[PDB]
């Protein structure tokens, strides 16, 4: 018999993104080639099958630095990290291939699905 | 020119609640009288003006245990912690006074607003 606040989840994600922009309570650095991205492990886990597996590992759960596969493009990762914290995906003709490949590696199934749909249309 | 995934924020919150239920990456214990509640500082901050202030404090940000004011009712806190992680509020005739008082202390303005509305109707 609960009541529900429609905007609650969106408001929570908005505040988590504000914490990310201000580097508050960030507990991991994701290294992608020469580039570094600060984030919250819980948000990464909630969005990605790969980060979910990494941070549930009894040894990796305690690492402050995670290095991604050298094939991963920093821009594709940046676009996906922004999507994790906002629900908004900056999908463009020039980045769609790198975004799909990065989403497949990160195991972000809904992003992979829209990338496949957008590629099929063109 | 971004696209948006409508269910993303709700899915993120659902996964954060799954992490809470399994005690994964929880980094704080909230003590309410004899009762203890494990949670994620970032989720508490995103939902509550009080926790936002506590965990942005350069000294309190590093505490693993937070003791609430002894006037705070553990059931009211439990109902509000569940709401933080689900968007669902178990508001009942028998708990509405304790829920409103706890939401005022925690600075959860939308919960305070619906409690005032529900009390006014009766």
């Amino acid at each position: 018999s609960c009541i529900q606040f429609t905007r609650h989840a969106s408001d929570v994600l908005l505040n988590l993104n504000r914490l990310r922009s201000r580097d508050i309570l960030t507990d991991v650095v994701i290294v992608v080639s020469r580039e570094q991205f600060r984030a919250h492990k819980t948000v990464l886990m909630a969005c990605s099958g790969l980060f979910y597996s990494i941070f549930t590992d009894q040894l990796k759960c305690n690492l402050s630095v995670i290095n991604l596969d050298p094939e991963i493009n920093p821009e594709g990762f940046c676009i996906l990290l922004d999507f994790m914290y906002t629900s908004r995906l900056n999908l463009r003709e020039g980045n769609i291939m790198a975004v799909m490949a990065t989403a497949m590696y990160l195991q972000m199934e809904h992003v992979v699905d829209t990338c496949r749909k957008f590629i099929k249309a063109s | 020119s971004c696209i948006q995934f409508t269910r993303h924020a709700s899915d993120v919150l659902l996964n954060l609640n799954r992490l809470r239920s399994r005690d994964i990456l929880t980094d704080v214990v909230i003590v309410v009288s004899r009762e203890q509640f494990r949670a994620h500082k970032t989720v508490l901050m995103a939902c509550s003006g009080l926790f936002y202030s506590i965990f942005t404090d350069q000294l309190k940000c590093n505490l693993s245990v937070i003791n609430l004011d002894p006037e705070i009712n553990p059931e009211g806190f439990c109902i509000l912690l569940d709401f933080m992680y689900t968007s669902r509020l178990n508001l009942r005739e028998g708990n509405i006074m304790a829920v409103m008082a706890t939401a005022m202390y925690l600075q959860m303005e939308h919960v305070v607003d619906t409690c005032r509305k529900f009390i006014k109707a009766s």
């Binding site: 009541i3 529900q4 429609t6 | 509020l89």
Partner: peptide, 4 residues
């Protein structure tokens, strides 16, 4: 607020 809604009835979910």
């Amino acid at each position: 607020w809604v009835i979910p």
